[PDB]
């Protein structure tokens, strides 16, 4: 219901800014925008409250703002401990709240790499066993924050879709996987099938046909 | 000092009724003018306010939960709870309990959170996996895999060529289908130098159903 | 205790459902009032108050800012209260002027319900002081 960008990156020392777009009744209707820092498997930390207010023990370098309906959080002078995922929330109406999708702040420790897309078609074995699944493999990319979509012929899909959250490889790089399941009639009715991954404004798109 | 500990089931059957309990420990519960809230994160997605209840006993749920939901308090044992009804696989998420403040400079924010507890909705009883291969070919580097589809519960273990082949290998996080069954992939990149020559086998292992599948993966 | 400074909160009996200007502010700023607050007589002891050095005349007025900020007709009572680890000392001396000694103190959880200008707040503040437990 609020809108953030998926990734946001910077190298050590630099300053980074994160949007969080709402409506006139969400943000821009109230000065109760909050920001939360979430390291994995750990309890989220509140870092900005009431638009631009650092709680006690939250460093000088985090700062909030909003222009109109787009709140924004800035981190001045990156360090390794800042690499995490950041959400924004805003009060809305008589007692209600909305959040953003989350933004992966990657503090760059190595060269960026665009994703390698391999898109496996359903195996013989699976087809012969009535079922069919398309496996998108996304590999050797950095930062670790992507977005997948599927297409039948050239029409977008989200019925029958599940996706991994980006996970590290032996070479400190990131990998992820999306699956598309369907009946074999759906498989050989459509002309072709496209898996497309958005990694930082770029959009790679592999295609397989029957 | 005031931390929040959430307890509850890991699994619940569809149409049933999840109920989680959060235990405050610092620290007030009843004592304060805070709000005691439930927030779930769909891993990724992903974040959503369920509702909260005030020390005075005032409840405030999210409008989008058409009576599927009640929240309540034990001023006594410094703990509170949510009861979500008629759950579907959709309701699968991590559930955080959190303290909402209406202090000035922290108004309508969530200062204290809980570490989170994972909750999975599924009908499925224990099921062993179907191991389907993912073949390369020339359709230097090749890349091939094992799709371990439709099993329950987790975990599943893969290893290629009885643990000899470790380099270039990556196993993915498992992924819960709307069915209520898990599914994952394992993949290794290789010198296509040896596709007609070097044999490659994934060793799937599902202890819950006491199943072990070893799948040949080869070209074309 | 130590006499100290902390971040307070407000409470009111405001109606969630209605348009009167700072009913509207309070419903999005304050909690509900407890119909039975605590009032504990000081036995025996006396403490020094100073309405002129009271940082409740410092947070009040910043909430009055955000009140009018979104404001553009009847005012209702707002109470100001302390968080855990703190409490409000109240002066019950009838010829107390604002400063100096006060033999009849008591402790309260929240202030009285206040009709809503620093000086207008101090007209009612005078008898209140924050300390830390």
Residue numbers in the entry:
A (entry chain L): 4 to 27, 27A, 27B, 27C, 28 to 95, 95A, 96 to 106, 106A, ...
B (entry chain H): 1 to 35, 35A, 35B, 36 to 82, 82A, 82B, 82C, 83 to 100, ...
C (entry chain G): 45 to 116, 210 to 253, 475 to 491
What do the authors say?
A stable ID construct of HIV-1 gp120 was developed, expressed in both mammalian and bacterial systems, and characterized by structural and functional means. Through two phases of rational structure-based design, we obtained the ID2 molecule, which displays the A32-like epitopes within a minimal structural unit of gp120 consisting of 167 residues and constrained by the engineered C65-C115 bond to adopt a CD4-bound state. The C65-C115 bond links the α0 (layer 1) and α1 (layer 2) helices and thus stabilizes the ID in the CD4-bound conformation. Our Fab A32-ID2 complex represents the first co-crystal structure of mAb A32 with its gp120 antigen and permits the precise description of the gp120-binding footprint of mAb A32. Accordingly, mAb A32 recognizes a conformational epitope formed by the β2¯ strand, the α0 helix and β1¯ strand, and the α1 helix of the gp120 ID. mAb A32 binds to gp120, almost entirely overlapping the footprint and mimicking the binding mode of the mAb N60-i3, a human Ab isolated from an HIV-1-infected individual of our natural virus suppressor cohort (Gohain et al., 2015). Most of the Fab contacts are contributed by its heavy chain, with complementarity-determining region (CDR) H3 making contacts to the β2¯ strand of gp120 (residues T51LFC) and CDR H1–3 contacting the residues of the α0 helix and the β1¯ strand (e.g., W69ATHACVP motif). In contrast, contacts to the α1 helix of layer 2 are almost exclusively contributed by two arginines of CDR H3 (R99 and R100B) with some minor contributions from the CDR L1, CDR H1, and the FWR1.
